[PDB]
């Protein structure tokens, strides 16, 4: 029975508001508190507030009071969380979760054990608009070889939003590939590298191509990676 199904990922501008839904199974809605907890990328967990859906009673963490509104609707078995005046700071996965006060019979909030969680809803806050990547070679050289093997790659720069996908030689090359997590630059655009190690002898005969797709902008770049004089 128990299910907390959240709405899809959101991309918002600074100053706007976002409203996330958490659709619940009937028994969960009727008997328990629904709590909201967020997690910024690479970070810990932060309580925002919770609601008693059958009454609509809401308590908020002090930090979010004035910006957060939690609501519930019985005719849809759903709880909503609205966060206003968004900033880049608010970029996070937003979780709903059920509080279960066992072993205590009386009361809704305490102890605040979050026993089931929704899948999360990613909210990304940025002034950037949709934009495909520029793809640069990371050229193999005598400064990218160890023993009989050479490292080479592609720098996938200045795109928004996540994600991009990178393959090598149209998928025929998987072994020794490391596609790194994207970093958010100070410009609001993401940037990522993908590297692969190969046998150095092959660099005479074997061409290496990275294949970079960014679905949001309908862009694809194939970049031939060529040795450098370094």
């Amino acid at each position: 029975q128990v299910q907390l199904v959240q709405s899809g990922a959101e991309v918002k501008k600074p100053g706007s508001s976002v409203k996330v839904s958490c659709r619940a199974s009937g028994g969960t809605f009727s008997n328990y508190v629904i709590s909201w907890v967020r997690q910024a990328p690479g970070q810990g967990l932060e309580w925002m507030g919770g609601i008693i859906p059958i009454f609509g009673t809401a308590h908020y963490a002090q930090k979010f009071q004035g910006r957060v509104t939690i609501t519930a609707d019985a005719s849809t078995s759903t709880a909503y969380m609205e966060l206003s005046s968004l900033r880049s700071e608010d970029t996070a996965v937003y979780y709903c979760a059920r509080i279960n006060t066992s072993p205590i019979l009386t009361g809704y909030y305490f102890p605040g054990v979050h026993d089931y969680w929704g899948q999360g809803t990613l909210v990304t806050v940025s002034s950037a608009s949709t934009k495909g990547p520029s793809v640069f070679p990371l050229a193999p050289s005598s400064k990218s070889t160890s023993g009989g093997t050479a490292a080479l790659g592609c720098l996938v720069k200045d795109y928004f939003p996540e994600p991009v996908t990178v393959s090598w030689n149209s998928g025929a090359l998987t072994s020794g590939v490391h596609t790194f997590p994207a970093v958010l630059q100070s410009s609001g655009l993401y940037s990522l590298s993908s590297v692969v190690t190969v046998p150095s002898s092959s660099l005479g005969t074997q061409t290496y191509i990275c294949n970079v797709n960014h679905k949001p902008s309908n862009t694809k770049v194939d970049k031939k990676v060529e040795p450098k004089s370094c």
């Binding site: 709590s35 907890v37 810990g44 967990l45 932060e46 309580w47 308590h59 963490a61 002090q62 930090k63 979780y95 979760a97 066992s102 072993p103 909030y109 305490f110 102890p111 605040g112 054990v113 979050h114 026993d115 089931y116 969680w117 929704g118 899948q119 999360g120 520029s134 640069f136 070679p137 990371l138 050229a139 050289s141 400064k143 990218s144 070889t145 160890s146 490292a151 790659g153 720098l155 720069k157 490391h178 596609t179 790194f180 997590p181 994207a182 970093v183 630059q185 940037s191 990522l192 590298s193 590297v195 190690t197 450098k228 004089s229 370094c230």
Partner: protein, 213 residues
């Protein structure tokens, strides 16, 4: 107001090991303490509530103890599915607060990074920016330090890095560090150096090139 702390920040263990993590509250919370497991890309899952009560369906190799301010999570015989981040949460009072997490990763023998360097492409330079990349490949443990040097002058604030998840085959990490300058600055200096510090190296290793070769 109730601050939660955890130690260690990370642990390396092998399948079959006993692993103990500690959590501490800044004031007493009786036994109103929960533990959660989280894996990458996934929601937290409840393991322990009331400090020591095992959540239904959770394997009995997980167990908790403690009351007041000091608490322990123990995994008695670790399995491959237990490599994850563990968080504590005080359930005593508003605002509910979580500890910062303890990551349990896979132990293997020490492996020094192979260190490679990549100058910026011809293409990028025309467009007015220069990205220099330093790759630290297949190392263990996770802990590592990169420093960028340009004509031997140390750099700060103009570089970014990320790290892959522990490799499922060889249990290593790789790390990418990017140094970003304008074309104007990049063409003022000659020698671009990545200096890497890590347990597996007996002293810090430098890889570099001369601009225009």
């Amino acid at each position: 107001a109730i601050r939660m702390t955890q130690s260690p920040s990370s642990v390396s263990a092998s399948v079959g090991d006993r692993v103990t993590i500690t959590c501490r509250a800044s004031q007493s919370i009786s036994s109103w303490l929960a533990w959660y497991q989280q894996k990458p890309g996934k929601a937290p899952k409840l393991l322990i509530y009331s400090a020591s009560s095992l959540q239904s369906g959770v394997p009995s190799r997980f167990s908790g103890s403690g009351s007041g301010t000091d608490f322990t999570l123990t995994i008695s015989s670790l399995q491959p599915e237990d490599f994850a981040t563990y968080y504590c949460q005080q359930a005593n009072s508003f605002p509910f607060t979580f500890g910062p997490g303890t990551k349990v990763d896979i132990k293997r023998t020490v492996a020094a990074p192979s260190v490679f360097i990549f100058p910026p492409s011809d293409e990028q330079l025309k467009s007015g920016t220069a990205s220099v990349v330093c790759l630290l490949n297949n190392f263990y443990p996770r802990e590592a330090k990169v420093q960028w040097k340009v004509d031997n002058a140390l750099q700060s604030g103009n570089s970014q890095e990320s790290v892959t998840e522990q490799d499922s085959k060889d249990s290593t990490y790789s790390l990418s560090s990017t140094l970003t300058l304008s074309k104007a600055d990049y063409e003022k200096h000659k020698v671009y150096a990545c200096e890497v510090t890590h347990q597996g190296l007996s002293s810090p290793v430098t890889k570099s090139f001369n601009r225009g070769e």
